[PDB]
Structures are given as C-alpha cells and as structure tokens.
Design a protein around this nucleic acid. Structure first.
Ligand SMILES: [Mg+2]
Ligand SMILES: [Mg+2]
Ligand SMILES: [Mg+2]
Ligand SMILES: [Mg+2]
Length: 136
RNA sequence: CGCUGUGAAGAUGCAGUGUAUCCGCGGCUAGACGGAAAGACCCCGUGAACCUUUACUGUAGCUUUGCACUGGACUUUGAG
C-alpha cells in the first residue's frame, strides 16, 4: 500500500516519501488518526501544492512543543486529594485526573501521551522528564 | 352311514362289504386334517427394518497447520 506522509512517523517518516507498508498499518492507524494518505496519482500532485504551507506549520507546532515542554519543566505541583501512602493512596495515582493539576498552574497540558506504564511526551523529537510529588 | 382296503401316502363320496323307514327336540364334543389369522417356528428372496463393531465408504462435531481479517517495535534465527 503506497502512501505519502502528512506527519513524520518514528521509523519511516520522511513526510512525503513513497513508503510501502502493510495494509493494516494504514486503514487502522495512519489514515484514521491522520499521519499519511494513500498515493492516488493526484494526492502526490496536490502534496507539492500544499507542502510549502504545511512543513512550516509542522515546524511551528513542533516549535511550540519544545517551548511548552521547557516552560513547565520545573513544576512540583502537588495534589490535594486524600491519600493513604506515598505511592499507595486511597484513589489512583495515574494519568487519569492530573490534567487539572497542571492546567491550574500554566498550560492546559492535554493528556494524550503522558507516559506512565513522569516522562511527558508531546512530539517525536520532544519529550520532557517531569517529576510529580504527592503529599500523603 | 360303519368297516376293511385303495388312493397326492390317515376317505361321508373310490372298491368290496355290512348296516340302515322319513323328520325334529334336548344333550355331548370323536371326526368333518372343524371356524378364525396368505405360520410367527424352519428354509428361501442377490427382500426390509432397526441394532452393533477394530466390516467398507462417508459424515456432524472436536482438533492441526497455511492463507485472509492482521498491525508497530525490539531481540535468538540462512542466503544475497
Ligand atoms: Mg382308511
Ligand atoms: Mg358342550
Ligand atoms: Mg382349521
Ligand atoms: Mg404363507
């Protein structure tokens, strides 16, 4: 399945390269979310008609990513929820309700890639090692 | 009608012979191979059915792997 990219993917992302991928990589991940588009012999024609105005935007969203990742890299924001122990609380210490904790002291910081299986991820080449402290 | 023979081989009907007027009624069941059911036993039909199994050939189901749905990455794995 020949597709051309819109955003850059981690392994094969050249943002417009003729990439041959399994049919399940597209149709289930890339096309629905939006990270690429099928080459229909005209999408590539219309990609150059929009590449000039899109790669500058892609840098701009990337530029805002590092600015936001570095602006709020020194917060020690603490929750006021009831807890039983530092690590074993009455609720759940996870990326489910901390959105309002960081939004009240700066950027909203919508939680989509705050990895915690506190390194928050926001772009392919941008990642911040935030540290969360909770009083218990 | 009986008897003795004969006879598809156990006779009311054939032969010989004996007995015996015609016709009921109440009884009895020895025979009419008495009535009833195209013997069920037995054998046969290149008949049926249902049942069994390590009869044959199949098959539901269960199970194995290939391919599709079906993808990313990292690692132990041959030749270019
Ligand atoms: Mg006689
Ligand atoms: Mg009587
Ligand atoms: Mg009779
Ligand atoms: Mg008969």
């Amino acid at each position: 399945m020949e597709v051309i990219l819109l955003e850059k993917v981690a392994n094969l992302g050249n943002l417009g390269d003729k990439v041959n991928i399994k049919g399940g990589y597209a149709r289930n991940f890339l096309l629905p979310q939006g990270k690429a588009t099928v080459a229909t012999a005209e999408n590539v024609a219309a990609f150059e008609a929009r590449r000039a105005e899109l790669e500058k935007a892609a840098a701009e969203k990337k530029a805002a990513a590092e600015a936001r990742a570095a602006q709020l890299s020194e917060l020690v924001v603490t929750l006021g929820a009831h807890a039983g122990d530092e690590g074993k609380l009455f609720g759940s210490i996870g990326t489910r309700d901390i959105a309002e904790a960081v939004s009240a002291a700066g950027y909203p910081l919508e939680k989509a890639e705050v990895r915690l299986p506190v390194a928050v991820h926001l772009h392919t080449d941008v990642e911040t090692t935030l540290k969360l402290i909770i009083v218990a």
